[PDB]
Design a protein around this ligand. Structure first.
Ligand SMILES: [Cl-]
Ligand SMILES: [Cl-]
Ligand SMILES: [Cl-]
Ligand SMILES: [Mg+2]
Length: 119
């Protein structure tokens, strides 16, 4: 099995930044970040291959968030800039060695809450 562990969640002022990280227990072919707003379908945020140069982003975070990886540490990061209230959600990482475009991901982290507020 593969285990995953997210870190770096919390609450921040709108317009601020966060950086989520995800420890993956062993080498996998792909890794991704997902988010699930209240009552809503879980959605792709950003995905990455371990070896290629491939990344893909959800439209609404394109150009604000960046996915990156540290291969030596088996860690995947989600740098989140210019945060908006609509970025509020539980953020999860996932990984496996299924083909890059596959809709189902075999191994999931625990999630962490992200709350963005204007106040
Ligand atoms: Cl920022
Ligand atoms: Cl797999
Ligand atoms: Cl699941
Ligand atoms: Mg999209």
């Amino acid at each position: 099995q593969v285990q995953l562990q997210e870190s770096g969640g919390g609450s921040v002022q709108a317009g601020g930044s966060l950086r989520l990280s995800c420890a993956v227990s062993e080498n996998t072919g792909r890794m991704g970040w997902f988010r699930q707003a209240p009552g809503k379908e879980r959605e792709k945020v950003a995905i990455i291959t371990r070896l290629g140069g491939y990344t893909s982003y959800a439209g609404p975070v394109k150009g604000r968030f960046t996915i990156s990886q540290d291969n030596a540490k088996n860690t995947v990061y989600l740098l989140m800039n210019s945060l908006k209230p609509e970025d509020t959600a539980i953020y999860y990482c996932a990984a496996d060695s299924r083909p890059i475009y596959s809709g189902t991901w075999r191994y999931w982290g625990q999630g962490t809450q992200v709350t963005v507020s204007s106040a």
